[PDB]
Structure formats: C-alpha cells, structure tokens
Amino acid sequence: SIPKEGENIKIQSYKHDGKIHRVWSETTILKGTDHVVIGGNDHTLVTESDGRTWITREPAIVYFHSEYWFNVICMFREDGIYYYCNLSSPFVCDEEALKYIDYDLDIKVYPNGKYHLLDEDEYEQHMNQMNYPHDIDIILRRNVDILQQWIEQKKGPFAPDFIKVWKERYKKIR
Ligand SMILES: Nc1nc2c(ncn2[C@@H]2O[C@H](COP(=O)(O)OP(=O)(O)OP(O)(O)=S)[C@@H](O)[C@H]2O)c(=O)[nH]1
Numbered sequence: 001s002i003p004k005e006g007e008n009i010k011i012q013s014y015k016h017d018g019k020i021h022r023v024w025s026e027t028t029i030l031k032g033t034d035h036v037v038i039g040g041n042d043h044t045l046v047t048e049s050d051g052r053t054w055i056t057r058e059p060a061i062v063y064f065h066s067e068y069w070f071n072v073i074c075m076f077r078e079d080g081i082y083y084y085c086n087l088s089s090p091f092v093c094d095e096e097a098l099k100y101i102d103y104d105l106d107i108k109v110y111p112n113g114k115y116h117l118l119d120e121d122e123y124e125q126h127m128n129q130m131n132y133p134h135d136i137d138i139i140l141r142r143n144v145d146i147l148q149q150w151i152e153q154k155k156g157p158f159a160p161d162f163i164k165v166w167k168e169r170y171k172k173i174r
Pocket residue numbers: 022024041056057058059060073075084106119
C-alpha cells in the first residue's frame with residue numbers, strides 16, 4: 001500500500017485511544033517508498049475532532065517515516081519556512097488514508113532554525129488518561145532527542161536541498 005507519485009491521499013491523525021484527532025483531506029504524493037512518504041498540500045480541507053472544517057491557505061510539504069516516531073510539516077509562509085513536527089507512531093498507509101497516532105509532544109522550528117519543544121504538559125496528562133505503556137514513553141523521549149539532532153544537522157526534511165527539490169516538484173505537479 002505504497003502510495004504512488006501523483007496520487008491524492010487523506011492523512012488521518014489518531015489519539016492512542018483510537019479517536020480521530022485531525023484529518024487533512026488532500027495531499028499530492030511526491031515520493032513513496034517502503035520507508036518514506038513525501039507529499040504536498042495547498043487549500044486542503046482540515047477536520048478537527050469536533051467535526052469543524054478549515055482550509056489551509058499556504059502550501060506545505062509533509063514527510064512521513066516508517067521507522068521514526070515523528071512526522072514533519074514544512075509550511076511555506078511569507079517570512080520563510082516553518083516546520084511543525086509531531087511526535088507520533090510511524091505511519092501505515094492503506095486505500096483509505098495514511099494514518100498515524102499523535103503523541104501530544106510537538107516541535108516548532110522557526111525560519112532561522114531555532115526549535116521549541118511544545119505540549120510537555122499535555123503529554124503528561126494524556127499519558128496518564130490513556131495509560132501509555134512505559135516503552136512508548138521511552139521511545140517518544142528518545143525520538144524527541146533524535147528529532148532535535150536532525151534539526152541541528154539540517155538532515156532529512158530540515159535540509160535546504162530537500163526543500164529546494166520538493167518545493168519545485170510540488171509547484172510543478174500542482
Ligand atoms: N498542511 C498544513 N498543515 C497546517 C497548516 N497550518 C497549520 N497546520 C497544521 O495543522 C495542525 C493544527 O494546527 P493548530 O491547531 O495550530 O495545532 P496545535 O494547536 O499545535 O495542535 P494540537 O494537535 O496540539 S490540538 C498542526 O499540525 C499545524 O502545524 C497549513 O497551512 N498546512
């Protein structure tokens with residue numbers, strides 16, 4: 001169920017209790033491998049857990065990994081590239097959507113590369129409410145460190161050459 005270049009896919013974010021958190025209706029696949037999915041979206045519907053719908057106003061590139069517990073949204077804003085990183089389960093794709101579990105913690109990267117770790121308080125409350133196993137807490141804490149090391153190395157989607165290649169590829173196919 002590797003999505004194909006040019007295919008439009010839904011992206012569904014769940015909580016650990018199986019409830020939907022967030023859904024992006026339309027992302028165009030730019031690359032699809034056994035380990036990595038890269039997509040672009042622009043003016044996609046977005047649905048919240050109360051059913052409310054909003055529309056994205058600017059393009060973004062999304063990056064999904066089958067072996068890391070995070071995913072990344074690269075947002076093209078006027079003053080430059082912001083990243084929003086979800087601590088998550090790795091993804092699985094089927095005919096319905098690309099799917100992941102959202103694990104509360106997130107990392108904002110500003111255009112000059114500085115990062116802020118978000119929702120540590122929301123993580124501790126949700127971990128107790130939904131009873132995350134000890135190994136998940138260890139994996140997520142480790143993947144916070146890995147994600148920060150990737151930002152500091154400008155690796156994977158944090159690479160300027162990654163943005164140059166995939167921003168252009170998405171402008172052309174859209
Ligand atoms: N693809 C896309 N995603 C966007 C855009 N603007 C914001 N988002 C993403 O949509 C999601 C919801 O935005 P927002 O409500 O600001 O997040 P939040 O409050 O941090 O999210 P939460 O999961 O902790 S309840 C976030 O992942 C955010 O980065 C956009 O233009 N395009």
